[PDB]
Amino acid sequence: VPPLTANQKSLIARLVWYQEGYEQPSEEDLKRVTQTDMPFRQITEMTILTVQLIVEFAKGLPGFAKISQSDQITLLKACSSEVMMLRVARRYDAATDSVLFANNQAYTRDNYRKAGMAYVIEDLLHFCRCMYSMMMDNVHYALLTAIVIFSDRPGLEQPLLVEEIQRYYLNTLRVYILNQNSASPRCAVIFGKILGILTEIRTLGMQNSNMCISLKLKNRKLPPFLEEIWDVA
Amino acid sequence: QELSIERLLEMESLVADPSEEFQFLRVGPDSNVPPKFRAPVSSLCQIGNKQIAALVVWARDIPHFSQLEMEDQILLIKGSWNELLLFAIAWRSMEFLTTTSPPQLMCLMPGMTLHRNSALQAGVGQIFDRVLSELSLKMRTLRVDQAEYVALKAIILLNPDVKGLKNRQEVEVLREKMFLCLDEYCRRSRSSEEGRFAALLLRLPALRSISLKSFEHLFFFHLVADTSIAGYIRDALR
Numbered sequence: 001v002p003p004l005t006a007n008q009k010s011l012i013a014r015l016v017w018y019q020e021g022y023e024q025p026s027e028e029d030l031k032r033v034t035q036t037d038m039p040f041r042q043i044t045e046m047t048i049l050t051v052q053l054i055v056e057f058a059k060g061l062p063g064f065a066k067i068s069q070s071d072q073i074t075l076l077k078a079c080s081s082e083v084m085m086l087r088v089a090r091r092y093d094a095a096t097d098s099v100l101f102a103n104n105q106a107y108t109r110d111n112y113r114k115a116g117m118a119y120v121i122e123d124l125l126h127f128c129r130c131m132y133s134m135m136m137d138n139v140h141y142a143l144l145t146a147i148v149i150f151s152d153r154p155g156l157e158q159p160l161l162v163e164e165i166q167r168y169y170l171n172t173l174r175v176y177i178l179n180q181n182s183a184s185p186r187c188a189v190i191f192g193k194i195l196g197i198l199t200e201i202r203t204l205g206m207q208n209s210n211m212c213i214s215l216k217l218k219n220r221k222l223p224p225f226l227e228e229i230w231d232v233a
Numbered sequence: 234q235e236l237s238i239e240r241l242l243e244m245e246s247l248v249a250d251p252s253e254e255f256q257f258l259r260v261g262p263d264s265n266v267p268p269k270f271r272a273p274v275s276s277l278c279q280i281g282n283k284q285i286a287a288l289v290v291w292a293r294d295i296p297h298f299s300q301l302e303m304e305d306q307i308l309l310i311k312g313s314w315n316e317l318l319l320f321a322i323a324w325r326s327m328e329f330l331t332t333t334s335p336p337q338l339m340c341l342m343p344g345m346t347l348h349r350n351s352a353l354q355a356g357v358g359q360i361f362d363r364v365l366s367e368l369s370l371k372m373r374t375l376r377v378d379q380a381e382y383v384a385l386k387a388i389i390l391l392n393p394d395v396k397g398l399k400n401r402q403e404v405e406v407l408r409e410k411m412f413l414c415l416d417e418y419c420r421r422s423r424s425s426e427e428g429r430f431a432a433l434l435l436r437l438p439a440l441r442s443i444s445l446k447s448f449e450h451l452f453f454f455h456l457v458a459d460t461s462i463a464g465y466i467r468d469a470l471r
């Protein structure tokens with residue numbers, strides 16, 4: 001039964017370390033922001049912090065520094081809203097049907113309404129329910145995040161390099177699943193359901209795009225950091 | 234009758250009934266399509282309506298599908314028809330792929346092709362190219378066969394994450410069955426290539442993005458009958 005090679009385990013451990021080190025903003029970053037359009041400003045300001053964290057996880061990934069500066073921006077701009085969806089899934093509370101922010105306040109459908117983001121919250125919470133219905137662990141989550149980052153995106157100069165890099169992470173994920181379940185047939189089902197997430201976050205990511213465009217058109221105060229990364233023309 | 238790649242394979246060689254005239258796609262009275270190009274676009278809408286109708290009769294006869302709640306059946310086809318149509322276009326257009334100038338030809342249906350210059354004229358060149366590179370070209374390099382293709386079609390349709398499903402678990406069992414079928418097949422037809430299972434399923438997110446982008450164009454030109462679609466699907470399955 002296919003074991004994990006020394007490099008796959010070293011890879012898994014690294015990603016698990018970077019993951020929990022970057023899952024919440026630093027104490028000082030968080031205190032600076034909370035040092036206080038309330039829902040709207042905390043949603044947008046926390047989203048800046050989240051995107052900063054995603055970028056720092058990405059750069060810590062093996063494979064990333066091997067990719068040209070132009071393709072790094074292409075990968076980061078395209079994938080950052082999708083990875084953000086995995087991060088909210090981990091902070092979702094089923095019992096209260098809400099998202100737990102880094103300050104420990106629970107944000108409901110109502111808070112997103114008052115912040116003018118009712119468009120986005122329905123499908124997000126549904127995703128969260130479906131995503132916490134899966135009961136995913138830290139390794140699945142870490143590997144999946146790397147798989148999203150190294151996905152094929154339009155405008156890549158070296159998409160075969162990126163594919164090769166992503167292929168190593170998919171294999172690590174597949175072999176890690178086989179080692180969790182003693183290589184039974186249902187390993188394909190677990191692996192398939194996980195890969196299925198890649199497709200549902202493309203919808204949510206595009207909804208995030210539309211929300212940003214909408215906010216700009218409705219003359220709402222959307223930060224330039226976010227306008228920049230998500231190409232809100 | 235069991236959900237198997239064998240049965241999906243024998244479902245491709247079956248013809249939809251002509252008497253299912255449903256207008257999922259149509260040039261509206263409100264549409265911003267220029268007068269001169271109403272005729273071609275209306276024709277293409279009609280070609281798409283034929284295919285949609287074919288996908289409905291296809292879906293309805295998938296093993297265990299007609300045994301699902303009727304409202305759920307409608308939801309699964311509503312959520313997947315656009316992806317299925319683009320997937321089928323991408324499969325058909327592999328034939329028309331021949332330094333390394335970008336592919337010029339999209340097979341809309343047997344006999345009929347759409348040229349790049351026309352997609353350019355219509356302002357849909359980017360998306361035309363993505364269908365042909367991320368789908369057609371990719372499926373050629375991967376050498377996806379018909380068995381693999383019909384498996385992915387069923388997986389596309391059998392989506393338990395569709396919003397508003399009643400018996401969510403009854404879809405999940407049908408999709409999990411398809412993962413097993415697909416994985417079994419891949420370990421047998423291609424036991425040499427590690428990563429084929431994942432490589433086949435990586436096409437699905439790409440197809441979702443492309444599908445979402447095509448809806449934006451369709452709604453901009455007022456080509457889609459959003460309110461009536463659910464009624465047509467109910468009518469057609471009936």
Ligand SMILES: C/C=C/CC/C=C/CC/C=C/CCCCCCC(=O)OC[C@H](COP(=O)(O)OCCN)OC(=O)CCCCCCC/C=C/C/C=C\CCC
Nearest residue numbers: 266267270277281318351352354355356357361447450451
């Ligand atoms: C999943 C959907 C698959 C269903 C398949 C059936 C196709 C439905 C219609 C799609 C049209 C394909 C583009 C070719 C248009 C041919 C006519 C033409 O050249 O007019 C140009 C005209 C210049 O005017 P204009 O006002 O000067 O144009 C503005 C400047 N360009 O353009 C127009 O008037 C508008 C044409 C309608 C474009 C709708 C495309 C949306 C669907 C995209 C995905 C479908 C697959 C095809 C990929 C290419």
Ligand SMILES: CC(C)(O)CC[C@@H](O)[C@](C)(O)[C@H]1CC[C@@]2(O)C3=CC(=O)[C@@H]4C[C@@H](O)[C@@H](O)C[C@]4(C)[C@H]3CC[C@]12C
Nearest residue numbers: 023024025043044046047050087088091100101102211
């Ligand atoms: C248009 C827009 C601003 O991009 C909308 C983003 C919004 O819809 C999201 C996806 O729902 C954002 C808003 C607040 C948010 O950034 C977050 C606020 C938080 O306090 C934490 C901060 C970090 O720890 C994240 O890793 C998780 C979380 C919950 C993130 C996840 C993504 C959230 C929940």
